[PDB]
Design a protein around this nucleic acid. Structure first.
Ligand SMILES: [Mg+2]
Ligand SMILES: [Mg+2]
Ligand SMILES: [Mg+2]
Ligand SMILES: [Mg+2]
Ligand SMILES: [Mg+2]
Ligand SMILES: [Mg+2]
Ligand SMILES: [Mg+2]
Ligand SMILES: [Mg+2]
Ligand SMILES: [Mg+2]
Ligand SMILES: [Mg+2]
Ligand SMILES: [Mg+2]
Ligand SMILES: [Mg+2]
Ligand SMILES: [Mg+2]
Ligand SMILES: [Mg+2]
Ligand SMILES: [Mg+2]
Ligand SMILES: [Mg+2]
Ligand SMILES: [Mg+2]
Ligand SMILES: [Mg+2]
Ligand SMILES: [Mg+2]
Ligand SMILES: [Mg+2]
Ligand SMILES: [Mg+2]
Lengths: 180, 118, 196, 350, 147, 104, 126
RNA sequence: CUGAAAAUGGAUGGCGCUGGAGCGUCGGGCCCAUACCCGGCCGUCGCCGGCGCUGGGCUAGGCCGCGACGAGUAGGAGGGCCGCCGCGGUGGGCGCGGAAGCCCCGGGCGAGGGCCCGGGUGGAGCCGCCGCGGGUGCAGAUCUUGG
RNA sequence: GCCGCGCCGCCGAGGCGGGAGGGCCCGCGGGAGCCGCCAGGGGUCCGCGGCGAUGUCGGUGUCCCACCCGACCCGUCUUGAAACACGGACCAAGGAGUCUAACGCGCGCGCGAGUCGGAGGGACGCGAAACCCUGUGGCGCAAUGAAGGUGAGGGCCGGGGCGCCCCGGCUGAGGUGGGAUCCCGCCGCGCCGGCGG
RNA sequence: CGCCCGGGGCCGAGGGUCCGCGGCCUCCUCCCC
RNA sequence: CCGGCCGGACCGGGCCACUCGGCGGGACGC
C-alpha cells in the first residue's frame, strides 16, 4: 500500500520515429550513436527532432533562413534544419548559404547551389560536425498553420480573436447574432 | 549499402522462416542460419559460406569476391577442403583470419564446418 | 574523521553528565537542550486519509505504512508532526538507532533510484562538495544536525522498516493513553529495535 | 535533399548466347534513386485496388416479404413474422439480420469506394524505387528469383530479341542467360489454390518469374507469351504491380538494349529532367551515404566519441555491515580499530 | 481496412463502448442542427457566433464574373516574368524598363504588400492600390492602366 | 462581498479610485480579477511593508558585513529547540501542587 | 541427444485456466473468456472462485517454451527446413509436421540423425 | 434483581461456560491478511541507461544493466508469432506412402487468446511467412432456424 | 541580570608547556614485490549412499475418486441482486457499430507557393489495370466592410525641422524579458569542468 | 552491530575488483620432530 | 605505380534538323 498516483507515470514522448522510412531510420541509427557517445547537446536535440512528426517539423522558407543567417556572428556557420527548406520567391539574393536539411525543394536547391552555397545531409553533418560545431540549428514556424488559428478560448467569448469553423465565408455565414 | 539493403530484407524475405517464436534464414551463405544483420549471407560485400561438398566427404568454403558484386555468375569463389578434421578447421581459420575476411564469422564458420564433417 | 566522531560521540554525552551533576550538586536543575533530531515512523495505512494529513505525510516522504525519515525539529516541523499524530509514531532517536538504520536499512537516492549503500564512493560523489566523504560523515550529519542535514537526509531513502516484532499496543490511540501514535520521547528507540 | 551524382558503373549488353556482345551501356540514374519500400507498398496497395469489380447484395434480399410483428402478448420475441397460412414459412422472422432468410446487417452497397487515386509524383516515385531495387543482387535473391548464375544483375540483352517470333527462341535465350532455373521454379510452384477461389476461376496458382522489359514489340510479346512466369512490360509503360508483385520490390527483370537506353530519358538524371515526361525528375536523397558502419568508423567521428563503457555493472547483494565484518570495515576503516580496542578492554576489565 | 477498426477491440465488451447507464439510443438530442436555440444554444453561441439572424443587403442574381478581380502583391510581381528579364535589366538601370503585364498573367489589381527590387519597371494592370503605385514610382517605375 | 478581506496589487490608478488584481479561486482555476474600487475600501498591506523593510536591512547588513569582512545571517529560521540551561531554585523548594477535591 | 543445458524449469501454475461456468454448460467451452459481468464473482476475484489468467503467471524467460527434455520445439516440413537447425542443435529440436506423408518422414528422420538434431516424433507413421 | 407482554421452534454465532468461557482494571505469551520486511519470477514504467570497439555477441524494431511500480466498472489507448474468410506475393511449401473436417482416460507448449504433435476416422485438397480486403470471433436479445 | 578577579567543586568536558620514572598504545616508519589466506563485486563440493525388464521408475496438469479448506446463478437495469427482480430447459448453425457523402484533429506519404486531372483526350487473358497529356477548375497565396469599396515594411545612419515628422543614404520586420542550440574569452585539468559575455 | 559464541527454518537469483589479513622480501632462539 | 571507364551547380576550346525561354545572342545537352 504505497500512496503514489500512476496517472502520469508513463511519459508521453516519441522514443522512435513513427515513420517507416528507411533513410530516416538510418539517420536515427546514426544519431542514436552520436547522442549516446558524444556529450554534445546538439546531437541530443537533432535526435529528438528526427522523431517528431511533420507538423512538428515545419518548412523553413529561404527568406527566414537568410534572415537568421545574416545575423551577427553567423557568417561561416552551417544552417541545420531538421525538416524541409522551401524556396521563398519574394527574395532575390542568396548569401552563399551552407545548409543541412532532410528535404530541399527543387526551387530552393536551384538557388542555394547557384549562389555558390553548399547543401549537406545529416550523414555528412555527422562527419563535418560530429558535436555540431559552428552549426545554427533553425526551426520552421510551428504555430503558423491554419489549424492553430481555430485554437483558443472559443469564438463565442469576449476577447477571443479565435477563428470559427465555417463551411463558407460570406455575409450570411455566422455574422448576425453574437457579432453585433 | 548493406544497412540500406538490411532495412528491406529485415522482415520481408523469401528466406525468412518465422515460426515457434524463432526466425531462421534459408539463404546459402548464412553460417548460423540466423536472420540477423551480421550473419545475413547476401547483404555484405564479404560473405563466408561453409557448404558440404558435392560428394559425401569434404566442405566447401564459399567466399565473395571483391569485384564480383553485381555479376552473380562470377561473384563467389568456392574452396573445396577435403582433409582431416583438425586440418580442415585450420584451413578455414587461415582463410578468415589471415585475409582479414569477416573475422567476426571466424568461429561461426569453424563450428559450421565441424558440424558438416559429422 | 571516524576516530574523531568516535571520540566526539562520547564527549557529547559526558558533557551533559558533568553539567547535570553540576546542577544537582548545587541543588539547581540542568534542563538539557530540546532534541533537534526526530525519527518519524508512519503506522497507519493509505485508506481513508484526510487531504491535509495526506499532504504532510508526503512532505515527510512517508507514503506507505512502516517507513521512517529523520526530521530536523523546529517550529515549522513540529506543527507538521502535530497535523499527522494519529498516522505517525515519532520520537528522539539515539546514536545506535541512527547507525543501525543507515547501516542495515540505509539506501541512497542517486537519480530517484533506490541504490543500496555498499561503498563510500556513492556518498562522496554526491555529498563531497559538503564535506561528506564516508558513511560516518553521513551519520555524523544526521545524528548531530549539521549545516548540510537537509541534503544529507534527503540523500537517504526512506527506511522501509518491517512490522514491529512483538506487536504494537494500540495503533489507533496516542502513546500517552496506552497506544502507539504520537510522540514517544526516548521510547522510539525500543520501537526501532523491533522494526529495524 | 541531395542527389547521387556519383560515378555509375558501365552495364554490359549480352548477346543471345549469354556472353558479352562488346557493347556497353552506362547504368541509368534511375537505378540510384531512393529505394522506398513504404512508398512502393503504399502505391501498390492502392493501385491493386483499381482493377477490382464491384460486388453487392441485391436490394430486395430479405425484404420481398410482407412480415408483420405479432406485437407483445403472444409469448413470441416481437420479431416481424411471416403472415399465416398452410406453409412452414408462416410465423418466422423475415427482416432482422439474426433471422434465417432475412436481410444481412448493412447490405453491401455497389457505390462502395473501390478505387483509390494516387498522386502522379508518388506513382512515379514507387517505380523509381522498384527499378532501383531490381539492380541489387540481394533484393532479387531475397525475392526468391534464381539469379545465382545470371551474367549480370541488370540483365540487358541486345535488341535482336525484340524480333523473336517463336517460343523456342525465347526458351533458348533463357537457357543461355542461366535464367531458366527461375522458370523451372515457376513450374515447381504450379499448384492448386486453397479456398473458394477454385470456384471463382482461380484454381491454379504459381509464382512470378523474370520480367522481360522491351522498347519495341516486333514479336517479342508472342515469343515470351507462352512461357509461364514471364511478364512483358513495355519500357514506356511500366506497371508497379508487375515490377513489385505483392508490394515487395526486387523482381528479376531482363532488360533490352533499346529499353535500357530509353530508361534514362523516361525519368532523367538529377542533372537533366525527363525528356519523355512533362516536368518530372528523380526524387532526391535525404542520406547520401547509407553505409552506417563506414560513417561511424570514420576518424572524424571517432575523435568526438568518449570511451566505450564496455563494463557491465550488476546489482549487489548489500550484505549487512552490522553483521558482516569485511563489509563494515569497507565503509568504516576505524571499525576494525574500535572492535579491537573493545575486545582488549573487555579482557582487561575481566 | 477493417482490421484496424475500433469495433475489432470491442468484441466481447457488452456496451460496445457506449456505456451501460446511458445506452446508445437513436437520437437522444434531435437530428442535425436541432435545438440550436433551445437545448443547443450554449454550444451554438459559444462556437458558432452570428449564426442566427439576418445581416446585410440581398443580391438576387449574383454573377461572380463581374466582381472577378484577382490581386497580386509587389513581393511576387516579378514572378510574372522570367528571371533573365529582371537580371538583364538590373545591369542597365538607366536604360529601358521591362513591361510586366499583370492582366495577361491573370491579375487585374496590383497591391503593395511587399517591397520591390531597386530597378524601374513598367507595370500594366487594371487597378492599382495607392501604396502599390507609390512603391513603383519611388523605385523608378510607372503604372499603366489597362481597360 | 467575495473580495472583502482579499488582497491584491494595484495596476491602475484613477481619481479617488484604483484597480486591483485580486486572485479568485472559482473551482480549480485561481483567476486574476481586475476590479475597480474606490480608496475608502482599501488599505496598505502591512505585510508587504514589513518585507520591504527586511530587504532594506538585508541589503544593509550584507553591505556592512562586507566592509568589515564578517559574515552575518539573513535567512529567517523557525523557532529552534531551546538550548540547554540551568534553572536556579533560589533556595526555596518548588511549590507542591495536587488536584483539588470536587465541590458541588 | 542431450541439450546444451537442462535447467530446472519452474512453472507457476500447471492447471488450465478454465472459463467461468464452463462445466455447467456444454455450450460454454473451456477456452478462457474474461468475465465482464457487473455482478460476476470471478471478475471481482472473490475468494474461492476460478482464477483469472493475468501477467505474473508468466514463466521464466530463460525456460519459456522449453520442452520437458530441455530443447525447444520447432516445426519442420522438409529437408531444407530441417537443415536450418544444423547449428544450435543443442537448443532446438525438430518436429515433423502432421500433413507430411510417411514416405517423406523417413527421409527427414534419417537426415536429422546425421545432423545430430533431435526429433520429437521420430517414429510417427512408419 | 424488580419494573420487563406476541404470536412456526431458536439463537452471547453454536456447544456450553459460574475458583469464570461473566463484568472492570492490567501483565506476559501466542494466532494470521492479497498489509509490512527479505528473496525468486512475470510485466509495466522510469533511467540526459549501456553496446556500431567483434567463447558468446549486435533479428540495433536487437541485446544488456539499474531502480521503482502492479485493484478496477463505465471508458480510453496500445500490443498480439490470438483466431476466421478472401487477394497480391513467397516458401523449388504439404498431400491417395492419405488433405480438410471430426473424435481422443495420447504427448506437449503459451500468463491468456490459442497452437503443435500422436492415434483413430475420413477420402482430396491444404498451409506457414510479408503485405492487402472484410458480410471476421457469441451464452444470453420472452434472439432466428433446426434438432 | 551582565563584566572583572579570587576561592572551591567538576571519571578524564578538557585543552596547552615542562618535569621522576613506570608501560599501554599508532592508517608513523610496509610496497609499481612475489606467495597464500579470506565475515571480501548472489553456490559450491577437486563429498556420498541406496534401487535395476514381467514388476518396478518418472510423468500421467486436462480420466475417476477420496478428504481438509474456500465456495449462493449467470447476464442485466440498479444507490443496492444469490434474490420472493427480469431473460435463460438443452445442443448446433445464424446473429448486432456497417457503408457513402461531408467536417474536425492527430498520424504517415508526395510535392511545395504552390498543389491535385477527381471531366475528357492520347498511347496500347490479366488490360474496366497500368502509362502519357490536358490546370478549365478546386483548395491555398489577402484581408476587411452591410455595401459602395479599399486593401497590409520594419530598422539603421546623416542632415534638417523642434512640437509630435520633411530629405538623403545603407539595408530588408522593430523593441523589452525568457529562450534549446551554436560562438568567444578566461581559469582549472587540444580534450574535460568553473563564470564572463 | 558492544564483546564473543551457538542453534532452527527458508534459498544460491546472477554467470567472459574493492576492503581486511598472513608468510617471504631481516638475523636468530624455543616448542613440536 | 599504374591505365581505362563513369558521373558533374567543372574549366577552356570546336560542332549539332538540337532544344530553351513575355531576351542573332543567353542558357540547356549531343
Ligand atoms: Mg479505516
Ligand atoms: Mg478510525
Ligand atoms: Mg417488403
Ligand atoms: Mg438471404
Ligand atoms: Mg477451409
Ligand atoms: Mg471494460
Ligand atoms: Mg446495453
Ligand atoms: Mg447519453
Ligand atoms: Mg448515435
Ligand atoms: Mg499450462
Ligand atoms: Mg455491482
Ligand atoms: Mg435485567
Ligand atoms: Mg522486495
Ligand atoms: Mg466472406
Ligand atoms: Mg457478423
Ligand atoms: Mg449459442
Ligand atoms: Mg427477497
Ligand atoms: Mg424489465
Ligand atoms: Mg423463464
Ligand atoms: Mg456461431
Ligand atoms: Mg528577444
Amino acid at each position: 500500500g504505497i500512496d503514489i498516483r500512476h496517472n502520469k507515470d508513463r511519459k508521453v514522448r516519441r522514443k522512435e520515429p513513427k515513420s517507416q522510412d528507411i533513410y530516416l531510420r538510418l539517420l536515427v541509427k546514426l544519431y542514436r550513436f552520436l547522442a549516446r557517445r558524444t556529450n554534445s547537446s546538439f546531437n541530443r536535440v537533432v535526435l529528438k527532432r528526427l522523431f517528431m512528426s511533420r507538423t512538428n517539423r515545419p518548412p523553413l522558407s529561404m527568406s527566414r533562413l537568410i534572415r537568421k543567417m545574416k545575423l551577427q556572428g553567423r557568417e561561416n556557420k552551417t544552417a541545420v534544419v531538421v525538416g524541409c527548406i522551401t524556396d521563398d520567391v519574394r527574395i532575390h539574393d542568396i548569401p552563399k548559404l551552407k545548409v543541412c536539411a532532410l528535404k530541399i525543394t527543387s526551387g530552393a536547391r536551384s538557388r542555394i547551389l547557384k549562389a555558390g552555397g553548399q547543401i549537406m545531409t545529416f550523414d555528412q553533418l555527422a562527419l563535418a560536425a560530429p558535436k555540431g560545431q559552428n552549426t545554427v540549428l533553425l526551426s520552421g514556424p510551428r504555430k503558423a498553420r491554419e489549424v492553430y488559428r481555430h485554437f483558443g478560448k472559443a469564438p463565442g467569448t469576449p476577447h477571443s480573436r479565435t477563428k470559427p469553423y465555417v463551411l463558407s465565408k460570406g455575409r450570411k455565414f455566422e455574422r448576425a447574432r453574437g457579432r453585433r | 549499402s548493406a544497412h540500406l539493403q538490411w532495412m528491406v530484407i529485415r522482415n520481408c524475405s523469401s528466406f525468412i522462416v518465422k515460426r515457434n517464436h524463432q526466425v531462421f534464414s534459408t539463404e546459402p551463405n548464412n553460417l548460423k542460419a540466423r536472420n540477423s544483420f551480421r550473419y545475413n549471407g547476401l547483404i555484405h560485400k564479404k560473405t563466408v559460406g561453409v557448404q558440404p561438398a558435392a560428394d559425401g566427404k569434404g566442405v566447401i568454403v564459399v567466399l565473395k569476391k571483391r569485384a564480383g558484386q553485381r555479376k552473380p555468375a562470377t561473384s563467389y569463389e568456392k574452396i573445396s577442403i577435403n582433409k582431416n578434421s583438425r586440418s580442415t578447421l585450420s584451413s578455414v581459420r587461415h582463410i578468415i583470419r589471415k585475409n582479414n575476411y569477416r573475422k567476426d564469422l571466424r568461429m561461426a564458420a569453424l563450428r559450421r564446418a565441424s558440424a558438416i564433417l559429422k | 574523521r571516524a576516530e574523531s566522531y568516535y571520540k566526539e560521540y562520547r564527549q557529547i554525552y559526558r558533557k551533559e553528565v558533568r553539567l547535570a551533576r553540576i546542577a544537582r550538586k548545587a541543588g539547581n536543575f540542568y534542563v538539557p537542550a530540546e532534541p533537534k533530531l526526530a525519527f518519524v515512523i508512519r503506522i497507519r495505512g493509505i485508506n481513508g486519509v484526510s487531504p491535509k494529513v495526506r499532504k504532510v505525510l508526503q512532505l515527510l516522504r512517508l507514503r506507505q505504512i512502516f517507513n521512517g525519515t529523520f526530521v530536523k525539529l523546529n517550529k515549522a516541523s513540529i506543527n507538521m508532526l502535530r497535523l499527522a499524530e494519529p498516522y505517525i509514531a515519532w520520537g528522539y532517536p539515539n546514536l545506535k538507532s541512527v547507525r543501525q538504520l543507515i547501516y542495515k536499512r540505509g539506501y541512497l537516492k542517486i537519480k530517484n533510484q533506490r541504490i543500496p549503500m555498499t561503498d563510500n564512493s556513492l556518498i562522496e560523489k554526491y555529498l563531497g562538495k559538503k564535506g561528506l566523504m564516508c558513511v560516518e560523515d553521513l551519520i555524523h550529519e544526521i545524528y548531530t544536525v549539521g549545516k548540510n542535514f537537509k541534503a544529507a537526509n534527503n540523500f537517504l531513502w526512506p527506511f522501509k522498516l518491517s512490522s514491529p516484532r512483538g506487536g504494537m499496543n494500540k495503533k489507533t490511540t496516542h502513546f500517552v493513553e496506552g497506544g502507539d501514535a504520537g510522540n514517544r520521547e526516548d521510547q522510539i528507540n525500543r520501537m526501532i529495535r523491533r522494526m529495524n | 535533399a541531395v542527389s547521387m551524382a556519383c560515378a555509375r558503373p558501365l552495364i554490359s549488353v549480352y548477346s543471345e548466347k549469354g556472353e558479352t556482345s562488346g557493347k556497353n551501356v552506362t547504368m541509368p540514374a534511375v537505378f540510384k534513386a531512393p529505394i522506398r519500400p513504404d512508398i512502393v507498398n503504399f502505391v501498390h496497395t492502392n493501385l491493386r485496388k483499381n482493377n477490382r469489380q464491384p460486388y453487392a447484395v441485391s436490394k430486395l434480399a430479405g425484404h420481398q416479404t410482407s412480415a408483420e410483428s405479432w406485437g407483445t402478448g403472444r409469448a413470441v420475441a416481437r420479431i416481424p413474422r411471416v403472415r399465416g397460412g398452410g406453409t412452414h414459412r408462416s410465423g418466422q422472422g423475415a427482416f432482422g439480420n439474426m433471422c434465417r432468410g432475412g436481410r444481412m446487417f448493412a447490405p453491401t452497397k455497389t457505390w462502395r469506394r473501390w478505387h483509390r487515386r494516387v498522386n502522379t509524383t508518388q506513382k512515379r516515385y514507387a517505380v523509381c524505387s522498384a527499378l532501383a531495387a531490381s539492380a541489387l543482387p540481394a533484393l532479387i535473391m531475397s525475392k526468391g528469383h534464381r539469379i545465382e548464375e545470371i551474367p549480370e544483375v541488370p540483365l540487358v540483352v541486345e535488341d535482336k530479341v525484340e524480333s523473336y517470333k517463336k517460343t523456342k527462341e525465347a526458351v533458348l535465350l533463357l537457357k543461355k542467360l542461366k535464367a531458366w532455373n527461375d522458370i523451372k521454379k515457376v513450374y515447381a510452384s504450379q499448384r492448386m489454390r486453397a479456398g473458394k477461389g477454385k470456384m471463382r476461376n482461380r484454381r491454379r496458382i504459381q509464382r512470378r518469374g523474370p520480367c522481360v522489359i522491351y522498347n519495341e514489340n516486333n514479336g517479342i510479346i508472342k515469343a515470351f507469351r507462352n512461357i509461364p512466369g514471364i511478364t512483358l512490360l513495355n519500357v514506356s509503360k511500366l506497371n508497379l504491380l508487375r515490377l513489385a508483385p505483392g508490394g515487395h520490390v526486387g523482381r528479376f527483370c531482363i532488360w533490352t538494349e533499346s529499353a535500357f537506353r530509353k530508361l534514362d530519358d523516361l525519368y532523367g538524371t538529377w542533372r537533366k529532367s525527363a525528356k519523355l515526361k512533362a516536368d518530372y525528375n528523380l526524387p532526391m536523397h535525404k542520406m547520401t551515404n547509407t553505409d552506417l558502419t563506414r560513417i561511424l568508423k570514420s576518424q572524424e567521428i571517432q575523435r568526438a566519441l568518449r570511451a566505450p563503457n564496455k563494463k557491465v555493472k550488476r546489482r549487489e547483494l548489500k550484505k549487512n555491515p552490522l553483521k558482516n565484518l569485511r563489509i563494515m570495515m569497507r565503509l568504516n576503516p576505524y571499525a576494525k580499530t574500535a572492535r579491537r580496542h573493545a575486545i582488549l578492554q573487555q579482557l582487561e576489565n575481566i | 481496412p477493417s482490421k484496424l477498426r475500433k469495433t475489432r477491440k470491442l468484441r466481447g465488451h457488452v456496451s460496445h463502448g457506449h456505456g451501460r447507464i446511458g445506452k446508445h439510443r437513436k437520437h437522444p438530442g434531435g437530428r442535425g442542427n436541432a435545438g440550436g436555440m433551445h437545448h443547443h444554444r450554449i454550444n451554438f453561441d459559444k462556437y458558432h457566433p452570428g449564426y442566427f439572424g439576418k445581416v446585410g443587403m440581398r443580391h438576387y442574381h449574383l454573377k461572380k464574373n463581374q466582381s472577378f478581380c484577382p490581386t497580386i502583391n509587389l513581393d511576387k510581381l516579378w514572378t510574372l516574368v522570367s528571371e533573365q528579364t529582371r537580371l538583364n535589366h538590373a545591369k542597365n538601370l538607366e536604360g529601358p524598363a521591362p513591361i510586366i503585364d499583370a492582366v495577361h498573367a491573370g491579375y487585374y489589381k496590383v497591391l503593395g504588400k511587399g517591397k520591390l527590387p531597386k530597378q524601374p519597371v513598367i507595370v500594366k494592370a487594371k487597378f492599382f492600390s495607392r501604396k502599390a503605385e507609390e512603391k513603383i514610382k519611388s523605385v523608378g517605375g510607372a503604372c499603366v492602366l489597362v481597360a | 462581498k467575495c473580495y472583502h478581506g482579499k488582497t491584491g496589487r494595484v495596476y491602475n490608478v484613477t481619481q479617488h479610485a484604483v484597480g486591483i488584481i485580486v486572485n479568485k479561486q472559482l473551482r480549480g482555476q485561481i483567476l486574476a480579477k481586475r476590479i475597480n474600487v474606490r480608496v475608502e475600501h482599501i488599505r496598505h498591506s502591512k505585510s508587504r511593508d514589513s518585507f520591504l523593510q527586511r530587504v532594506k536591512e538585508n541589503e544593509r547588513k550584507k553591505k556592512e558585513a562586507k566592509e568589515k569582512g564578517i559574515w552575518v545571517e539573513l535567512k529567517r529560521q523557525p523557532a529552534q529547540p531551546r538550548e540547554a540551561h540551568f534553572v536556579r531554585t533560589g533556595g526555596v523548594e518548588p511549590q507542591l501542587l495536587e488536584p483539588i477535591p470536587y465541590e458541588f | 541427444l542431450r541439450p546444451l543445458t537442462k535447467p530446472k524449469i519452474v512453472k507457476k501454475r500447471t492447471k488450465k485456466f478454465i472459463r467461468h461456468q464452463s462445466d455447467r454448460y456444454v455450450k460454454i467451452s473451456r477456452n478462457w473468456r474474461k468475465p465482464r459481468g457487473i455482478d460476476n464473482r470471478a471478475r471481482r476475484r472473490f475468494k474461492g472462485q476460478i482464477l483469472m489468467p493475468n501477467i505474473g503467471y508468466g514463466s521464466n524467460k530463460k525456460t519459456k517454451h522449453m520442452l520437458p527434455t530441455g530443447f525447444k520445439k520447432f516445426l519442420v516440413h522438409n529437408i531444407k527446413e530441417l537443415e536450418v537447425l544444423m547449428m544450435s542443435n543443442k537448443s532446438f529440436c525438430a518436429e515433423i509436421a502432421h500433413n507430411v506423408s510417411s514416405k517423406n518422414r523417413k527421409t527427414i528422420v534419417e537426415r536429422a540423425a546425421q545432423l545430430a538434431i533431435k526429433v520429437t516424433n521420430p517414429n510417427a507413421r512408419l
